[PDB]
Each structure stands twice: as C-alpha cells, then as structure tokens.
Amino acid sequence: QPQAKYRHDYRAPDYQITDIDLTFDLDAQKTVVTAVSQAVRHGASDAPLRLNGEDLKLVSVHINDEPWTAWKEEEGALVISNLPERFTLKIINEISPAANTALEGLYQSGDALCTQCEAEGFRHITYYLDRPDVLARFTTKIIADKIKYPFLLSNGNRVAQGELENGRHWVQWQDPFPKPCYLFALVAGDFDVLRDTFTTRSGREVALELYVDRGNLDRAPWAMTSLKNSMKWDEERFGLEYDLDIYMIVAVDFFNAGAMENKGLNIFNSKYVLARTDTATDKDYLDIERVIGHEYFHNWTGNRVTCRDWFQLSLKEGLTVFRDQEFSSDLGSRAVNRINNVRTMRGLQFAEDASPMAHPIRPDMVIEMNNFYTLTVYEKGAEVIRMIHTLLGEENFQKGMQLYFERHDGSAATCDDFVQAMEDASNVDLSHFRRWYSQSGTPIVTVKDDYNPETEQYTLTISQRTPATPDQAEKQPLHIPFAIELYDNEGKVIPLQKGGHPVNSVLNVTQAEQTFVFDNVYFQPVPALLCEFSAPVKLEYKWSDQQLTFLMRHARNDFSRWDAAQSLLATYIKLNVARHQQGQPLSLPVHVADAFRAVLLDEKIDPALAAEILTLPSVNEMAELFDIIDPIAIAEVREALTRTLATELADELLAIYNANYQSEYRVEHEDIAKRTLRNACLRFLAFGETHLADVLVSKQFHEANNMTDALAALSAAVAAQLPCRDALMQEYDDKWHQNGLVMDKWFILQATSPAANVLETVRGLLQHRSFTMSNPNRIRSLIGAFAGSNPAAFHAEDGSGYLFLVEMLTDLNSRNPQVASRLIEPLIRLKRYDAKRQEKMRAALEQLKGLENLSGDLYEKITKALA
Ligand SMILES: N[C@@H](CC(=O)O)C(=O)O
Ligand code: NA
Ligand code: NA
Ligand code: NA
Ligand code: NA
Ligand code: NA
Ligand code: NA
Numbered sequence: 094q095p096q097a098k099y100r101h102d103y104r105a106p107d108y109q110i111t112d113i114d115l116t117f118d119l120d121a122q123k124t125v126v127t128a129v130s131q132a133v134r135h136g137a138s139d140a141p142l143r144l145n146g147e148d149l150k151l152v153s154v155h156i157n158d159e160p161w162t163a164w165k166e167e168e169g170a171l172v173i174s175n176l177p178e179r180f181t182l183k184i185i186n187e188i189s190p191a192a193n194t195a196l197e198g199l200y201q202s203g204d205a206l207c208t209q210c211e212a213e214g215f216r217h218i219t220y221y222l223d224r225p226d227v228l229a230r231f232t233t234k235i236i237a238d239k240i241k242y243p244f245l246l247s248n249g250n251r252v253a254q255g256e257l258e259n260g261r262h263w264v265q266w267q268d269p270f271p272k273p274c275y276l277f278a279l280v281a282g283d284f285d286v287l288r289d290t291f292t293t294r295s296g297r298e299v300a301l302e303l304y305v306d307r308g309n310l311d312r313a314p315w316a317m318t319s320l321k322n323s324m325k326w327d328e329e330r331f332g333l334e335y336d337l338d339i340y341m342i343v344a345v346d347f348f349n350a351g352a353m354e355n356k357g358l359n360i361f362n363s364k365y366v367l368a369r370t371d372t373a374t375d376k377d378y379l380d381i382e383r384v385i386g387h388e389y390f391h392n393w394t395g396n397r398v399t400c401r402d403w404f405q406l407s408l409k410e411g412l413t414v415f416r417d418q419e420f421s422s423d424l425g426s427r428a429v430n431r432i433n434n435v436r437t438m439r440g441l442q443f444a445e446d447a448s449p450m451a452h453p454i455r456p457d458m459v460i461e462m463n464n465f466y467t468l469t470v471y472e473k474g475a476e477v478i479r480m481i482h483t484l485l486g487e488e489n490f491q492k493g494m495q496l497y498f499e500r501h502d503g504s505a506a507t508c509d510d511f512v513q514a515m516e517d518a519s520n521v522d523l524s525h526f527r528r529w530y531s532q533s534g535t536p537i538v539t540v541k542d543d544y545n546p547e548t549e550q551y552t553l554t555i556s557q558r559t560p561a562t563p564d565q566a567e568k569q570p571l572h573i574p575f576a577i578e579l580y581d582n583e584g585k586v587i588p589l590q591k592g593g594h595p596v597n598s599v600l601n602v603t604q605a606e607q608t609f610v611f612d613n614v615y616f617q618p619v620p621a622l623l624c625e626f627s628a629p630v631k632l633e634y635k636w637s638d639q640q641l642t643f644l645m646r647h648a649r650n651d652f653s654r655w656d657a658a659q660s661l662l663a664t665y666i667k668l669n670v671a672r673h674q675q676g677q678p679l680s681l682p683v684h685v686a687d688a689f690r691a692v693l694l695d696e697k698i699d700p701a702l703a704a705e706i707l708t709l710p711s712v713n714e715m716a717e718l719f720d721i722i723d724p725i726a727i728a729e730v731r732e733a734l735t736r737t738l739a740t741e742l743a744d745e746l747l748a749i750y751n752a753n754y755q756s757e758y759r760v761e762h763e764d765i766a767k768r769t770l771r772n773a774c775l776r777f778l779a780f781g782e783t784h785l786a787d788v789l790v791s792k793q794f795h796e797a798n799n800m801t802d803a804l805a806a807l808s809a810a811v812a813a814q815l816p817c818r819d820a821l822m823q824e825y826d827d828k829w830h831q832n833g834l835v836m837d838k839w840f841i842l843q844a845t846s847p848a849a850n851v852l853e854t855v856r857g858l859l860q861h862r863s864f865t866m867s868n869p870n871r872i873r874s875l876i877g878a879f880a881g882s883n884p885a886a887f888h889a890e891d892g893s894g895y896l897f898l899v900e901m902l903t904d905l906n907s908r909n910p911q912v913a914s915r916l917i918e919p920l921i922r923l924k925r926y927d928a929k930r931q932e933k934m935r936a937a938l939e940q941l942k943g944l945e946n947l948s949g950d951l952y953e954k955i956t957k958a959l960a
C-alpha cells in the first residue's frame with residue numbers, strides 16, 4: 094500500500110526534459126507509443142534518471158540511438174543509470190486503451206479515444222518525468238485508422254499530415270509553449286464540429302472548434318457562445334488574451350471530472366457542453382457557462398503559470414475558481430452567485446473541513462493526489478483568493494495579478510509566490526494571512542456588542558478560534574477580514590469612524606480577542622456582520638429576530654438580506670429538530686412566517702434575491718448547524734417547515750407564481766430570475782392542499798415550453814409525493830430514456846425521493862436501460878445522489894444504506910477508483926452521527942478496508958476515517 098508524500102520533501106528534479114516528440118500508433122486494443130525526449134541533467138553527476146510509469150509494456154530504451162543496458166524497471170518506475178549530461182532518450186512502449194476503465198491516461202469513450210493526464214495520468218501513457226515542474230515543448234504525431242478516427246487532435250497547431258496504406262492516416266501537432274505533461278491531450282474519433290471565430294482585442298483571430306458526437310451539433314451553440322463570452326471577459330476584467338491560433342474543445346461522455354484545461358484542447362464532460370432548451374435547465378446553462386469559463390481561465394492561471402508540485406494545486410484551482418465566479422457574477426446576478434457559493438461553502442465544504450479528510454488549501458500530506466481535487470482546494474481556495482481581493486481592492490489585486498504573471502509566466506510556481514506577488518504589488522502585508530494556506534478547519538468568530546449612549550460609541554468585541562482537526566492539533570489565529578455595516582433605525586448607514594477619522598469597514602480580525610470601537614454613533618445601530626461572507630468562517634452572534642427582519646428589509650447588499658434570513662431560520666430549524674426528536678410537531682412564530690410573506694410581496698426586491706430567500710437551506714446546509722447530525726429529523730423538519738409556509742402563505746404564493754409567468758423562454762438573466770422565483774413559489778405550492786397542488790404541478794409539467802419548468806414540476810411531484818408523480822415520472826422516462834444527460838436528472842430525483850421504498854427503487858434502477866456502471870455520470874446521478882444527497886435514506890436506522898453503498902464500492906474500487914472515492918465520502922463522516930450509526934458505518938468501512946486489491950484512493954480515506 095502506497096506511502097504518503099509530504100510537501101516539505103519537495104526537491105528540484107535531477108533531470109529536466111525540454112522537448113518531447115511523441116508518436117502514437119493508435120488502436121483500442123493496443124497502442125504503440127514512441128517517445129523521444131531531450132534531457133538535461135541538473136542534479137548530481139551520478140544521479141540516475143527516474144521515470145514514472147504505470148501499466149506500460151516496455152519495448153525498448155535507447156539513449157542517443159544506442160540501446161541502453163544500464164536500467165531497470167521497479168514498481169511504478171524505470172530507473173536509468175550512467176547517463177551523459179545531455180542526451181536523447183527514446184522509449185517505445187505499449188498500452189491498451191480499451192482495458193482502461195479508470196479513465197486516466199489514454200482510454201476509450203464510446204468509440205472515441207481520449208486522454209486525461211491530470212494529475213498523474215501521463216505516466217500511464219509512457220515512462221516520463223510526470224511532475225509539473227518539468228516543462229517540455231511537445232510535438233505529437235498520431236497515426237490511426239481513417240474510417241474509425243478521421244479526427245486526430247492534440248495540443249497546438251497542425252504542422253504535418255499524411256496518408257498511409259491500409260486506410261490509415263496521421264496528423265502531427267506542435268505546441269510552442271512548454272508544458273508539464275498533465276496538460277497533454279490526445280483525442281481521436283469521429284465527430285460533428287461547430288466552428289466559429291473570436292477576434293481578440295489586439296486583432297488576433299482565433300479559430301474555435303467544438304467537437305461533439307455525431308448527432309449532437311444542435312446542442313453546441315450555447316457552449317461556443319460561452320467560450321466567446323469567456324475570452325471577452327478575461328480581456329476586459331484581467332487584460333488577458335488567448336495566446337494560440339486555435340482553441341479546441343471536445344465533449345466526451347465518459348469522463349470522471351467536469352472538464353480539463355489541456356492547452357488548446359480542452360476535453361469536457363458532455364454535461365458541461367451540451368444544451369438545448371428542451372434538454373437543459375437554466376442551471377445547466379449557467380453551469381456550462383461557468384465551466385467553459387473556468388477551463389478557459391486556466392489558460393493563464395494554470396497553463397502559462399503552472400504548479401511547482403501538486404501540493405500547490407490551489408494556486409491554480411482557487412484562483413481559477415475565483416475567476417469563474419467573478420465571470421459568472423459580472424455577467425449575471427452577482428448576489429445570486431455569491432449566495433450559491435456561500436451555500437456551497439457552509440453546506441458542503443465546512444463539512445469536509447470537520448471530517449477526517451480535512452486539509453488546508455495547500456495540503457501537507459497526500460497519498461493519492463486524486464483525493465485532493467476538493468471543495469477545500471477549490472472553493473475554500475477561492476474564498477482565500479477573494480479575501481486577498483477584499484484586502485487589497487480590485488485595482489491593487491489586478492496589480493498583483495500582473496506582477497504574478499510578469500514574474501512567473503512560463504514557470505511552475507507556488508502558492509507562496511502568488512501571495513508574495515500580491516503583497517509586493519499592493520504594499521499590503523500578508524505575512525499572517527499566509528496562515529490560511531497552512532491551517533485546516535473553519536474558524537469560529539464570536540462577536541459581542543455594546544452600545545453606550547453616554548459616549549455615543551458602539552463597541553464590537555470579536556474572538557476567534559478554530560477547533561482542532563484530525564490532521565492538526567495546534568491552531569492559531571488567522572487574519573480574518575471581517576466586514577461590517579451599521580444601520581440606524583430608518584435603514585441608513587452610519588459612517589464608521591474613530592477619534593476623528595474614517596475607519597475601514599473591513600475590520601482586521603487578527604488575534605484571538607480584540608475590541609473595535611466606533612465613535613459618533615448617535616443612535617443604537619443594528620449591524621450587518623461578515624458582509625458578503627468576507628471570510629470563510631462561522632459567525633456566533635446573538636441576533637434578535639427583530640434585528641434580522643430589519644436587515645431583511647433594509648440591508649443595502651442583497652447578500653446580507655439573504656443571510657439575515659438564513660440566521661432567522663437557523664434558530665427555528667434547531668428548535669424543531671429537538672422537537673422532532675421528542676415527537677413534537679413544528680412550531681414557528683407568526684412573525685417569522687410574516688417576514689417571508691413580506692418578501693413575497695415587496696415589489697422592490699429583485700426577484701433573483703427573493704427567489705433565494707424563498708429557497709430553504711438544503712439538508713446539507715441544515716446539517717452544518719448541528720454538532721451531532723440527525724438526518725431523519727432534519728429532513729422531516731425541512732418538509733414540515735415547507736408545508737407550514739405553504740399553508741400560511743398560500744394565497745401570496747399563488748399570486749407571485751402567476752405574476753411571474755413568462756410565455757417566452759429566454760436564457761437571459763432577468764428572465765432566469767423571474768423563473769427561479771416562480772419555481773421557488775411552486776415548491777411551496779406543491780405542499781398545499783393536495784388536489785390544487787396536483788393539478789398545478791401536473792399542468793406545469795405538461796405545458797412547459799422548456800426543461801427548467803418541466804423539471805421543477807417533476808421535482809415537486811416527487812418531493813411532495815403527489816398523486817401525479819408516478820405518471821409524470823414514467824412519461825419522462827418514455828420520452829427521454831435514450832438521453833443520458835437528461836435521464837441523470839431523473840435518476841437524481843429517484844435517488845433523493847422521500848418515498849419509504851426509495852432504496853428498493855434505487856436498486857431496481859441499477860438495471861434500468863439508461864443506467865450503466867461504466868459511466869461515471871450515471872453512477873453519480875443514481876448512487877452518488879442517494880448516498881450524498883439523500884442522507885435521510887442513506888442513514889436509515891436499519892443500516893441498509895451503508896450496505897448498499899458497500900456493494901456499489903466493492904465494484905467501483907476495481908473499475909474506477911476515482912468515482913469510488915467520490916462515493917465513499919458520506920461514510921467517512923461517521924463521527925458526526927450518533928453512536929448506533931457510527932457503529933454500522935465503521936463496520937461498513939472495515940468491510941471495505943478488507944477488499945482484495947483495495948485502491949489507494951479508498952485506502953487513504955478509509956484509514957483516516959477508522960482512526
Ligand atoms: N474540475 C476538474 C478539473 C479542473 O479543475 O478544471 C477536477 O476536479 O479536476
Ligand atoms: Na524543462
Ligand atoms: Na484541472
Ligand atoms: Na493548468
Ligand atoms: Na452582474
Ligand atoms: Na483526476
Ligand atoms: Na438589498
């Protein structure tokens with residue numbers, strides 16, 4: 094079983110490879126790879142060259158065309174001794190794409206051949222320095238059957254091509270930018286292609302090419318549009334242009350993650366490309382936008398400046414996630430973006446940071462690097478970049494970006510390099526701030542206030558601490574940017590000031606305990622605290638219900654209104670989960686329902702914001718409110734809350750639902766906001782009087798002129814168990830079974846059903862004609878959704894959920910360890926549950942621990958969990 098690697102052990106490579114010339118004789122069963130690398134020794138004279146390789150059949154090794162005798166293969170490697178200081182290495186080896194079920198390296202996706210090399214997949218293709226601080230100029234020649242693989246793509250530009258006998262042909266590509274090998278890509282296959290052009294602001298014309306399976310061309314234009322929007326935004330906001338002549342994107346159906354930023358040749362999960370208005374939701378559209386942007390933004394933050402080592406992953410991922418969010422936010426509703434990203438942080442990433450798998454955004458120890466493409470590295474990473482932006486402001490932040498690229502373009506850099514550039518450009522000290530890179534867990538910030546009428550001073554007393562995590566026992570105070578705003582009783586902002594002088598509204602919370610005093614506060618204020626979620630922390634402040642509804646009515650930033658609503662609900666969620674556990678039904682003060690009534694009827698509230706306030710926290714967000722999670726109580730309480738609101742607000746709900754009717758479907762931000770509000774009302778209405786509800790939901794499903802409205806109705810039928818549910822579900826199956834992406838939404842609904850027999854229906858679905866264990870999207874939509882988004886069923890008291898997940902992981906461990914490791918995440922959270930649940934979950938993990946051929950991916954998580 095493999096060994097952890099440690100950040101502190103980094104050392105510069107003994108050898109570099111500057112140029113590599115690859116040839117593939119491609120065939121599904123047996124591909125022959127010939128790799129000619131120019132190498133240069135940088136370390137000691139007697140150091141052997143250690144090349145990484147996995148599942149390779151070595152055919153030959155030459156050094157300057159001399160067959161080499163001074164080498165040996167060992168586990169995962171080829172070690173070559175006694176070398177000159179500079180030489181040409183030539184390796185020939187074979188691999189087998191068709192046997193590759195793990196989907197890393199060169200593998201088969203339906204009838205196409207494609208690659209996934211990040212993190213360490215290139216070593217599955219040939220023996221190489223598969224580490225991202227080795228940067229080479231690639232030239233890639235691909236030879237293949239002309240009829241099966243008429244398109245032969247790799248990074249860069251086409252520089253040669255020819256025909257051969259026996260119906261073969263080849264294309265050779267060259268990419269002038271030196272790159273680590275995780276950015277290599279190869280695709281071969283037969284595709285429809287949508288071609289278009291973007292002209293950069295300095296007048297460079299870029300050819301854009303989107304390759305999709307035959308018959309999918311009608312689902313390509315949105316993705317192409319989003320790519321152009323991405324290129325334009327990166328110019329306007331960051332000053333960055335694309336740096337090559339062609340930009341290819343290939344949509345493939347078998348892909349473990351969302352997409353991959355391979356230079357000039359991104360490969361995407363089809364989920365994040367294909368859309369038409371009858372197949373895809375507004376959410377899909379905005380996800381496609383996000384992910385096309387993200388991969389495009391990587392061209393600079395990732396490709397032109399790469400990562401010295403994998404412990405620096407957040408250097409590219411946090412930053413690129415921050416960029417995708419700023420892009421979505423600039424183009425769409427900034428408040429909705431921020432809100433959703435906060436919901437992800439509080440509801441999903443916080444849970445990871447309290448799990449056995451916790452780590453800092455820049456990890457210190459890793460066994461299987463594929464386990465570290467996480468909510469923490471990505472989402473918390475972005476929150477960290479956003480704290481830098483909070484602290485410097487946009488103008489200085491952009492100077493730091495410029496200094497970062499000027500210093501590091503064409504190299505592999507570290508997180509620390511990025512911070513240093515931000516500090517040097519801005520003259521803001523971020524010494525203490527760096528601790529966000531090295532410390533795990535979610536800080537808890539405790540605030541106490543005092544208003545003094547004699548002195549006309551408001552004083553905040555702010556504390557922080559981060560509990561210990563399983564990985565780190567010592568924790569220290571962070572540099573928390575803690576934004577506030579103070580409101581008088583009409584809703585006007587009170588200027589923050591002290592001893593004659595303006596005070597910055599971003600307070601520097603750097604110690605365990607400190608006090609901040611504001612002068613010239615002539616009237617007792619209501620504060621907004623942690624505005625725009627200015628740091629990724631838990632806030633402990635004893636809000637009154639009235640302060641919160643005041644904020645819902647007057648806070649200047651949309652986000653603060655949302656967040657005040659979430660704090661209002663939180664008290665009553667906790668109340669009612671304790672009640673539920675004692676058999677007591679839901680209790681909600683009248684004035685709380687009235688605060689939501691007011692939001693429904695305030696015509697001055699942006700519908701984008703109203704919709705989010707009227708979207709109740711998910712069962713994951715509700716779970717973060719508790720020390721011990723009771724998932725059955727949480728789910729029953731969320732249902733009961735929804736039915737209570739539905740009853741108390743029925744007439745207003747119906748009215749706003751009807752008022753937001755739109756006969757034209759458009760993918761435009763104002764329209765999306767109205768629809769989102771409409772459908773937020775629908776969710777409550779689905780839990781009204783049974784007959785009204787059944788009629789309204791069924792009508793929406795049947796008369797929808799787009800998938801957003803049809804899915805929302807179908808989902809409501811499922812959630813509220815309405816009489817029409819089985820018929821609507823069967824209709825959607827009959828209509829859409831041949832379409833995987835669309836059936837995924839139905840699999841999710843099945844898996845997250847509140848029906849008593851959900852598990853049984855889920856097992857049955859393992860034989861459904863649209864399901865297959867060969868496809869990660871199907872896996873995640875049916876199995877992963879059950880385990881991860883239906884905690885109430887997953888955690889059924891008879892333990893049937895755990896046994897089901899064990900059976901599924903027993904298969905996936907061998908087939909596709911990365912998807913297995915995604916799916917195991919719910920079981921590793923056992924210590925958040927009660928003793929009886931812990932016990933069955935430990936047993937399930939001990940069973941897994943005992944699997945023959947346990948993957949490293951699962952071994953890592955399972956041993957942290959059982960600790
Ligand atoms: N989203 C993919 C790759 C990326 O960051 O673009 C992953 O989890 O690796
Ligand atoms: Na190099
Ligand atoms: Na990536
Ligand atoms: Na990259
Ligand atoms: Na905007
Ligand atoms: Na991966
Ligand atoms: Na507002």
Ligand code: NA
Binds near residue numbers: 439444712714717
């Ligand atoms: Na949670």
Ligand SMILES: [Zn+2]
Binds near residue numbers: 387409410413414
């Ligand atoms: Zn990324």
